[PDB]
Design a protein around this nucleic acid. Structure first.
Ligand SMILES: [Mg+2]
Ligand SMILES: [Mg+2]
Ligand SMILES: [Mg+2]
Ligand SMILES: [Mg+2]
Ligand SMILES: [Mg+2]
Ligand SMILES: [Mg+2]
Ligand SMILES: [Mg+2]
Ligand SMILES: [Mg+2]
Ligand SMILES: [Mg+2]
Ligand SMILES: [Mg+2]
Ligand SMILES: [Mg+2]
Ligand SMILES: [Mg+2]
Ligand SMILES: [Mg+2]
Ligand SMILES: [Mg+2]
Ligand SMILES: [Mg+2]
Ligand SMILES: [Mg+2]
Ligand SMILES: [Mg+2]
Ligand SMILES: [Mg+2]
Ligand SMILES: [Mg+2]
Ligand SMILES: [Mg+2]
Ligand SMILES: [Mg+2]
Ligand SMILES: [Mg+2]
Ligand SMILES: [Mg+2]
Ligand SMILES: [Mg+2]
Ligand SMILES: [Mg+2]
Ligand SMILES: [Mg+2]
Ligand SMILES: [Mg+2]
Ligand SMILES: [Mg+2]
Ligand SMILES: [Mg+2]
Ligand SMILES: [Mg+2]
Ligand SMILES: [Mg+2]
Ligand SMILES: [Mg+2]
Ligand SMILES: [Mg+2]
Ligand SMILES: [Mg+2]
Ligand SMILES: [Mg+2]
Lengths: 70, 155, 116
RNA sequence: GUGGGAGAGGGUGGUGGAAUUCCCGGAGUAGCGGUGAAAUGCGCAGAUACCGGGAGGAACGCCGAUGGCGAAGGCAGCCACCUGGUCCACCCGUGACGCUGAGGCGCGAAAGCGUGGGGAGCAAACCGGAUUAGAUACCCGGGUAGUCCACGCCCUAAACGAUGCGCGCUAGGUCUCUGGGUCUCCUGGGGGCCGAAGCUAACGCGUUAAGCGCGCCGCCUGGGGAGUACGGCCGCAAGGC
């Protein structure tokens, strides 16, 4: 399986407003993806988590979602 | 059978029909090791069942034993306290054994004085779809479809 | 007396019971059923067979209301949490989609001693 | 000193969503809940389930780790402000200004105390239901103090790495966090795991020493009696030293 960073450009990990790329790091649900599937380093993941939370509070990213086909 | 599969005994064929189920039934009629008297019982019953109804005793025997074979039963399984009655299907070999045992036990629970008469009338009733052996079989099957709420305890 | 023709079906399953509420596309319920609505009384209500029978009974009441297309919502976990959906699939109601919307907190409340 | 860096380090104020409870409304019947089974309990004054709205308190899912920070206790949503510690590179400045530390002083989980607030969920005591030979328990239903906040006390702990602080010396290998570098790698500084020499009664320790040394502090001297008695000091008390 592909990790998120492997298929992505040279993007800003500190931009909470770019929903297009931050959506890639959320799961099928609103959960933040683990480092196993994001292919990020510890520092990269630590920054991404805070930017994702920022985007969430601005109503740009979903706090939680609903699972399908279950 | 802790180690092996306990290979099934292959009974000898029959001297009259050449069929093995007849030998099995004759063994189920035998008591105290008298296979001669049991064979005479079964064959006088064969004559009686072929005369009182003008059909071949072969296919009537086969159809009766087929009618008595059940398709489901219950076994007790210990889960969370006292055990429960869990339904399940049956092996073909066990279906054979249970059918023959119910045949003999319902035949000897009959009123008829002579043994051969009991055997013949029991086989007739079982071949028609009624009688005591088929009643016990249908009670076994009625145990299924009843406690079917335990269908998740199959094991 | 409604003729709804389409709606949602919520399956709330626990380890003590399973209940199904069939509702309309804007949230109001139409019919419902559970392991106690049908004959079972005690722990028997938590078996998957009771869940199947509850789903089937609710689906037939929905037929009485005239339900054809159904969207499924699932909350909770228990025996027959899936059997309810299987019976609901084979009940005669065309299943639109299945969704698991089990409510999970973000660690706000303190559980009972049983759950820690 | 300069220039960079990581962080649930602390304080203050704000703020977000999920969930529980409660209230309003809609729609909707006959049970829900609970257990190994059950019953108390709740429900026809309409519950449970579903939908919409409102209120309030507490705690921060995924990220999250075998991770990070702190002297220890301990510290996880997000934002801003105030502030501590620490690491690295440059080789710039002072020029032994150091180490330890009886007493003192400050900090110190939880529970507990006082005054005043707050109160969803949980929940000692307590009220019931079961289970059992009995049930004063485990299991179920309720439920007060408390848990939360402000301020002032309390000074305990398996307060644990059961390993005081500092410095120097003594094979490496592997995983990792965070810096710098000419960036298969090297070089610092933290977190683990194997293992040289050596140590150990053994288990085990082994550049994060329980090894080889040095300085300073604390403590030990058979078990029970007993962390008891008396005395003193501290404390509102409980009680602590
Ligand atoms: Mg139940
Ligand atoms: Mg902090
Ligand atoms: Mg802070
Ligand atoms: Mg209402
Ligand atoms: Mg009532
Ligand atoms: Mg009542
Ligand atoms: Mg209130
Ligand atoms: Mg976790
Ligand atoms: Mg540290
Ligand atoms: Mg700082
Ligand atoms: Mg110089
Ligand atoms: Mg000089
Ligand atoms: Mg000092
Ligand atoms: Mg001192
Ligand atoms: Mg304290
Ligand atoms: Mg306290
Ligand atoms: Mg108080
Ligand atoms: Mg409670
Ligand atoms: Mg209780
Ligand atoms: Mg009692
Ligand atoms: Mg020493
Ligand atoms: Mg580098
Ligand atoms: Mg190191
Ligand atoms: Mg190492
Ligand atoms: Mg050695
Ligand atoms: Mg070792
Ligand atoms: Mg040392
Ligand atoms: Mg030693
Ligand atoms: Mg002492
Ligand atoms: Mg002594
Ligand atoms: Mg004491
Ligand atoms: Mg004295
Ligand atoms: Mg005293
Ligand atoms: Mg006094
Ligand atoms: Mg005491």
């Amino acid at each position: 399986k592909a990790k998120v960073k492997a298929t992505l450009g040279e993007f800003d990990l500190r931009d909470y407003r770019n929903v297009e790329v931050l959506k890639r790091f959320l799961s099928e649900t609103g959960k933040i993806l683990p480092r196993r599937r994001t292919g990020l380093s510890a520092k990269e993941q630590r920054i991404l988590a805070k930017t994702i939370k920022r985007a969430r509070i601005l109503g740009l990213l979903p706090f939680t979602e609903k699972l399908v086909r279950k | 059978a802790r180690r092996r599969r306990a290979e099934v005994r292959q009974l000898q064929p029959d001297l009259v029909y050449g069929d093995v189920l007849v030998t099995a039934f004759i063994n189920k009629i035998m008591r105290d090791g008298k296979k001669n008297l049991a064979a005479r019982i079964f064959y006088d019953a064969c004559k009686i069942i072929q005369e009182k109804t003008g059909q071949e005793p072969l296919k009537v025997f086969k159809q009766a034993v087929e009618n008595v074979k059940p398709r489901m039963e219950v076994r007790s399984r210990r889960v969370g306290g006292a055990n429960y009655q869990v339904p399940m299907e049956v092996s073909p070999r066990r279906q054979q054994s249970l059918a023959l045992r119910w045949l003999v036990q319902a035949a000897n629970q009959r009123p008829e004085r002579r043994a051969a008469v009991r055997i013949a009338h029991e086989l007739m009733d079982a071949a028609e779809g009624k009688g005591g052996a088929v009643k016990k079989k249908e009670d076994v099957e009625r145990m299924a479809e009843a406690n079917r709420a335990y269908a998740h305890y199959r094991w | 007396k409604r003729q709804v023709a389409s709606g949602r079906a919520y399956i709330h399953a626990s380890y003590n019971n399973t209940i199904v509420t069939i509702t309309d596309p804007d949230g109001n319920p139409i019919t419902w059923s559970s392991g106690g609505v049908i004959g079972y009384k005690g722990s028997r209500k938590g078996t998957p067979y009771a869940a199947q029978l509850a789903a089937l009974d609710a689906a037939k009441k929905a037929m009485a209301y005239g339900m054809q297309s159904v969207d499924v919502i699932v909350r909770g976990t228990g025996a027959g949490r899936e059997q309810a959906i299987r019976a609901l699939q084979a009940s005669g109601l065309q299943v639109k989609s299945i969704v698991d919307d089990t409510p999970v907190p973000h660690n706000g409340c303190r559980p009972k001693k049983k759950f820690r």
